[PDB]
Write a protein that binds this ligand. Structure first.
Ligand SMILES: C=C(C)[C@H]1CN[C@H](C(=O)O)[C@H]1CC(=O)O
Ligand SMILES: C=C(C)[C@H]1CN[C@H](C(=O)O)[C@H]1CC(=O)O
Ligand SMILES: [Zn+2]
Ligand SMILES: [Zn+2]
Lengths: 258, 258
């Protein structure tokens, strides 16, 4: 009856409210994906509880054990009914779960500390003074690992071998490292997170260049689920009523500090 | 065995080749969607024939007869196996056919003759010296007809009553009218077509402002079809190998005359 909605902490998708320790259930959280889940559940007519995925991951299949981890795995093993999170719609994920049409459009992009002499991936690639890396795991690393475009192969090889490690564990950590490296570290991350950070104090970062690819986040459900279709139509309706635009503006720009 | 792929003439998606009258079958045509259909059919492993939809329409349901027209209707009535066209992924369409994940991202946008004093929808809305309209039918008209955002309601009402008619029958006609109206007509059309035209002689138009919405084109198949899933994974794979980016650059920018 009460559906399980798996999600994950990632600003401004899902964040603890100010006095979350005094709160219970869904009231503990706020953010874009909290509002989205509310709006979706309103259209599909379901009661639900948000659960933070236990292992803090998005969804990948271990090559050895073949187990899917993260929110994807919660869905694959039947421990959750829906995942509402900045979950990149990728082929390997689409093979084992169902994604709604994108609720947000995005692309891989470059974050620099203001003043860094870099405008594009090409600038990064033809040098090593300024180091650069992606998150340790996730779709961006995967984009680079799999590319057959020369510029991107060049970048993957560099990152793959760079010492010490150019990869970071979280968005926060990548941002901290740009911010501390005095212009000697650029972070490669989804354009959505990049744009959000740009609008946050100390306002010392910026997104430069166009995106490297074009993709989307989708709401995910287990294959064969009876919520699959209604959730899909819910996203499209929300997109069409301008609610997805309204929410993005709310969480990214209305609150903008720069 | 040989699957029917319904499509439609619309530059640079599908166009007659130079000597099409001397050619047969699929060889008559070229463009982005011709290349896409080739690439998809290669991954899904099917032989196919491109058929130009008979009634020159995309897909809407007549309110009186309840018949679906256009490429959508070819799919709904079983006369075609797949539609590969700049077919906007919309809720009313998604209710009766299956769309792949978007192969192209886009939004409603503004086309002006160079020099026109207009930067945004707001500028258009607060005046009448410069007339403006959309295609007679299609998803853009529908966006305006259904909006509950004030600026857009204002624009729909104006367009709805403007004399003579601000609506045009085709992309070509809308472009011609901008081009001839000496800065007194702006055309509201999908950002994809807008960007393509901007790169064509006489180079006297331009896209101004951001887009009014965010959506995509999807490849469409009948509900319950066994090609639905493989086509969906085909688009994602192509997106992921950078083939959709390569094709867009090919048909929009490589050939750019401005
Ligand atoms: C925040 C993380 C780790 C997620 C969010 N979208 C990607 C995902 O769905 O894999 C990841 C980021 C990226 O790989 O840059
Ligand atoms: C070219 C046309 C009439 C099509 C293409 N995409 C929209 C569709 O799928 O409805 C239409 C354009 C638009 O309404 O501005
Ligand atoms: Zn706390
Ligand atoms: Zn001809």
């Amino acid at each position: 009856r009460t559906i399980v909605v798996t999600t994950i902490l990632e600003s401004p998708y899902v964040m603890y409210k100010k006095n979350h320790e005094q709160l219970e259930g869904n009231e503990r959280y706020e953010g874009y994906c909290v509002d989205l889940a509310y709006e979706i559940a309103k259209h599909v007519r379901i009661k639900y509880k948000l659960s933070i995925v236990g292992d803090g991951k998005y969804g990948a299949r271990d090559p050895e054990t073949k187990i899917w981890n993260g929110m994807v795995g919660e869905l694959v093993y039947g421990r959750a009914d829906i995942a509402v999170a900045p979950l990149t719609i990728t082929l390997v994920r689409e093979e084992v779960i169902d994604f709604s049409k994108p609720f947000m459009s995005l692309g891989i992009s470059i974050m620099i500390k203001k003043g860094t002499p870099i405008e594009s991936a090409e600038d990064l690639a033809k040098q090593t003074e300024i180091a650069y890396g992606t998150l340790d795991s996730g779709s961006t690393k995967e984009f680079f690992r799999r590319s057959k475009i020369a510029v991107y192969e060049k970048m993957w090889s560099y990152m793959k071998s760079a010492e010490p490690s150019v990869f970071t564990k979280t968005t926060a950590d990548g941002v901290a490292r740009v911010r501390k490296s005095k212009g000697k570290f650029a972070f490669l991350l989804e354009s959505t997170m990049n744009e959000y950070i740009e609008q946050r104090k100390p306002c010392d970062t910026m997104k430069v260049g166009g995106n490297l690819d074009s993709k989307g986040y989708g709401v995910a459900t287990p294959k064969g689920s009876a919520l699959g279709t209604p959730v899909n139509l819910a996203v499209l309706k929300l997109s069409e009523q301008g609610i997805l635009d309204k929410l993005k503006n709310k969480w990214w720009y209305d609150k903008g500090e720069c």
